[PDB]
């Protein structure tokens, strides 16, 4: 993992936040406004609103470009963006901003078709009472032709409209000397929290780019360099491969994701297997197992024979991207060369050939390997079929397809009816959106499948394999 991540350069290649991602989000917000009411949606930052938080979420998503757990994970809004007013209407947009925040966002704000931007000189900057008066004047100027507005409550508000009235800006609106009266009385308002939060959890091209470019590289490197320990160890020490050590890196990275409060609050897998590494019979887990600390020499089907397959599985918590594979632990050649020193005092190398032993183990091994290959061929044909029609997504059809394919290859050797039952094979297919799990409604969201609203996981697992060299011997389980 050292000399790979030295070369990958994950951090350097993050996708920058481009304009075309920003226009789309802005237009999404206005469309919401059209459905909710007429005039617009209002964004007033923290100090003036007694430190609201949902506007932290919105300023992160609209400008900073964070999404998913990132929007929730950030808790501090920079002082540069501390004081701003934004108002979004179907016609135009109105922004009151400071020079530095303007400098950071210059390209984005000027990109919008209709922008009204106010930012004062340094000379106005030094007189802050001036700035207060300018703020109130701007607010009155923008606000006048309005009746129906959208507003976002806050955690400090605790869902009270009168707490919106409590905010200082509205109080200044309600000041007697001004005479216009209370803001809510003049203009009708409504809470929009549910809609905006619903929007936040969907995907976009920006984070699809992040999903392909950064997190995928990280996960692949983790998996590869985790399995590589077997490649690294010496030959004679290779038997003492305790499962705790091989599964240590997975557990460790999982904990580093686990420390954050937000991930724990947001959720956890629903009894899905946690990351793990298992060998032999242990691979047939009873929906939750623990890795043994026993060495390989202490595990064996019979005293003479040895286990020859292993299973690895992992998922990063933050987005629940799952990858799980099975690998093989034996050369599995039919016959092999055994060398014998002759006379034992000098030792003359004579090569005895055609060892029957590995042929015996090879029969069972070759069986199991052919099964693994057959599983993968099943899957790729499945995926062509799923593409051809959305309705075939249902797990039952994939189940039947894999069953009828797997039966054929090994049919000739043993009797089919005893050997195979549909209960010995299972499939799971799930749908994740930004760490949350949705439902599968393919007909109902066919209009919404033109874009990608979520991403998919498929897992397939075969249990209770029976040998053909011993009696009533279970070889284990296969997973992918």
């Amino acid at each position: 993992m050292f000399n790979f991540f030295s070369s990958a350069n994950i951090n350097q290649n993050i996708p920058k936040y481009s304009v075309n991602d920003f226009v789309f989000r802005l237009k999404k917000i206005e469309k919401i406004v059209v459905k909710e009411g007429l005039d617009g949606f209002l964004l007033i930052n923290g100090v003036d609103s007694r430190e609201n938080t949902e506007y932290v979420k919105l300023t992160n998503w609209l400008f900073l470009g964070n999404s998913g757990l990132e929007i929730e994970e950030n808790e501090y809004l920079n002082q540069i963006y501390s004081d701003m007013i934004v108002l979004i209407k179907k016609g135009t947009t109105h922004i009151f901003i400071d020079p530095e925040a303007l400098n950071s966002l210059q390209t984005l704000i000027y990109s919008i078709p209709n922008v009204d931007v106010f930012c004062p000189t340094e000379k106005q900057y030094e007189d802050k009472d001036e700035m207060e008066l300018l703020k109130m004047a701007f607010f009155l100027r923008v606000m006048k032709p309005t009746k129906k507005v959208g507003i976002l409550l806050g955690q400090k508000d605790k869902g009270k409209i009168n707490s919106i009235e409590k905010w200082p800006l509205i109080q200044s609106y309600g000041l007697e000397e001004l005479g216009v009266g209370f803001f809510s009385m003049n203009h009708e308002v409504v809470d929009l929290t549910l809609r905006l939060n619903a929007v936040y959890k969907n995907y976009d091209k920006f984070f699809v780019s992040k999903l392909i470019y950064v997190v995928a590289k990280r996960l692949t490197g983790h998996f590869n360099s985790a399995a590589g320990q077997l490649g690294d160890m010496k030959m004679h020490k290779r038997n003492l491969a305790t499962e705790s050590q091989l599964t240590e890196i997975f557990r460790d990275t999982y904990e580093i994701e686990e420390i954050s409060k937000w991930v724990q609050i947001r959720g956890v897998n629903a009894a899905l297997p946690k990351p793990r590494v298992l060998f032999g019979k242990n691979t047939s887990a009873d929906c939750s197992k623990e890795p043994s600390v026993a060495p390989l020499k202490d595990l064996k089907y019979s005293e003479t024979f040895h286990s020859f397959h292993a299973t690895f599985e992992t998922f990063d918590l933050r987005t629940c991207l799952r990858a799980a594979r099975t690998y093989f632990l034996a050369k599995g050649v039919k016959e092999e060369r055994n060398l014998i020193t002759l006379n034992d005092d000098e030792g003359v190398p004579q090569g005895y050939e055609l060892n029957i032993d590995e042929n015996q183990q090879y029969k069972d091994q070759d069986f199991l390997a052919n099964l693994y290959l057959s599983i993968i061929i099943g899957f790729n044909e499945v995926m062509q079929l799923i593409t051809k029609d959305y309705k075939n997504m249902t797990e039952e059809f994939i189940q039947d397809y894999i069953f009828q394919k797997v039966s054929k290859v090994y049919a000739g050797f043993q009797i089919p009816e005893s050997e195979i039952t549909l209960d010995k094979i299972q499939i799971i297919l799930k749908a994740y959106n930004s760490f949350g799990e949705e439902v599968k409604i393919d007909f109902k969201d066919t209009i919404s499948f033109k874009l990608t609203p979520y991403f998919f996981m498929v897992r397939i697992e075969q249990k209770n394999i029976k040998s053909q060299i011993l009696n009533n011997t279970v070889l284990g389980s296969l997973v992918f």
Partner: protein, 289 residues
């Protein structure tokens, strides 16, 4: 040869100077590796010397002056051989014990989170929180806090180096930023307070003869200087006790400006001194008119 071996032995020395880089590496190796990329480059501005010294030692092997040559030239290739050997060996052995380093990082982060917890818990009932009077001693405690989060910030940076070494999500910490912002405003204000009051005290001891406060009152000029200090007075960030203290004092400074412009002329004769001592009810002028 002197110049080039000096460069390369600096590089080997950096490979050998600290115990940390001997055990725990970092981004620094990349820069070494950059110079190791450059090592091709550096030898390209050395190859004038190899052939030339080949001509030299063809028929003058020397043995007398060769000492330094033998030291410097050999030292270059000493570096090169270790560069091979170490780079392989380290790379293998560090590949072996990766999990232990990850566990060390895990304990490091586990401790640092709670350190930041007790840190944030220290603030609310200690120091800059608006609780008590604390007349102008606050700079000491504020500066101890300065060193505190500074130390925390360097710890955070080494953690960031490790995390990016292993290619993990960089743990991001919100509280430290809050610390930094609040104190930034505080410390600019309090530094200004220190500057004003110390200058005010720089002046508090010149005599009648030394301090000129009459008609070309050099002190009234220092008062005018304070008129400009008053010109940097206004700031609407927040109202403090220390802030209004400085305001009251500088008002006093202005009061002094026109106070003593006419109170230093020959107009004041020891009976006027007398009148100042009685009518003010001050024993300052009763001990010394």
């Amino acid at each position: 040869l002197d110049s080039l071996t000096e460069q390369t032995k600096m590089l080997s020395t950096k490979l050998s100077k600290p115990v940390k880089d001997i055990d725990s590496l970092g981004y620094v190796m990349e820069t070494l590796e950059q110079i190791r990329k450059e090592q091709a480059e550096i030898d390209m501005k050395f190859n004038p010397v190899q052939e030339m010294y080949s001509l030299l030692d063809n028929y003058l092997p020397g043995g007398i002056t060769d000492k330094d040559e033998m030291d410097a030239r050999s030292l270059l290739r000493r570096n090169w051989d270790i560069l091979i050997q170490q780079a392989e060996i380290k790379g293998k052995e560090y590949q072996h014990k990766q999990a232990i380093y990850l566990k060390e990082l895990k304990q490091s982060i586990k401790d640092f989170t709670n350190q930041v917890s007790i840190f944030r818990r220290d603030y609310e009932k200690n120091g800059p929180m608006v609780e008590g009077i604390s007349p102008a001693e606050a700079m000491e405690r504020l500066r101890r806090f300065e060193d505190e989060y500074d130390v925390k910030y360097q710890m955070y940076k080494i953690n960031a180096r490790g995390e990016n070494l292993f290619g993990l999500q960089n743990q991001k910490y919100p509280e430290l930023e809050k610390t930094d912002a609040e104190i930034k405003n505080l410390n600019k204000l309090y530094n200004l307070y220190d500057s004003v009051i110390k200058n005010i005290q720089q002046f508090k001891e010149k005599s009648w003869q030394d301090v000129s406060k009459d008609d070309l009152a050099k002190m009234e000029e220092d008062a005018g200087k304070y008129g400009e200090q008053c010109s940097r007075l206004p700031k609407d960030l927040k109202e403090w006790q220390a802030y209004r203290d400085l305001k009251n004092y500088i008002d006093s400074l202005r009061e002094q400006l026109p106070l003593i412009i006419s109170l230093k002329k020959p107009s004041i004769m020891p009976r006027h001194w007398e009148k100042i001592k009685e009518i003010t009810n001050t024993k300052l002028n009763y001990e010394n008119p």
